[PDB]
Symmetry: C2
Subunit: 122 residues, 2 copies
Amino acid sequence: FLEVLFQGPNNELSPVALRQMSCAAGTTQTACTDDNALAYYNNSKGGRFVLALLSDHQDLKWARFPKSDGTGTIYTELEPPCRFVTDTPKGPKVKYLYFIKGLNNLNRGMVLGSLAATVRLQ
Amino acid sequence: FLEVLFQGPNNELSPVALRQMSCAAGTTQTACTDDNALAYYNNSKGGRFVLALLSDHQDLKWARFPKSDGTGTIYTELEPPCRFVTDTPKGPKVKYLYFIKGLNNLNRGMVLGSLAATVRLQ
């Protein structure tokens, strides 16, 4: 379970869990059927603020998240993939890291430095 | 020893050690006498690219690094401090995190997410 420390003004930084849940990505909103990736997020003013998708496919383009109210669903658009490989039982794998479109430059960093040591485990 | 994964184009990300060395910070370039903080860096095109300073003082403002040639010295300017506290033998401490002035918004993030789990160890 990844983390990232959050800055509570007056310049006070404090460790905040980098959450993960499974989701149904695809090339099309429509092609979003079964779950194929993992979503990394934080709950922001508006509950649930996903940042990146970790997946075994590099084919993805959109992600599907049913609203945290049971109201409807939210379809977020993905950026191009980021390939890297980590040791996995049954063989090492190339996981693709998808940064949600428009993902902040700091947030962008935040994750990259947050799971950096995770990818390095051999 | 902290880390951060580095992106080698064609979108390939790869774990890269987030290095640390001690340094002599102070309020003045001049006041930079004995070592009082730890510097986090990466070797970039121009060897040695420090990003942040971890220190027990919140008084710092400048840092001193003798050139990686034995030529001279480089005085980098620090940004305002970032207080947080972590468990330490002999009592928990408030360490101050100083981001070098002009530190990129991604690099900014990179470190924050890189030592996030480090600060959370109780």
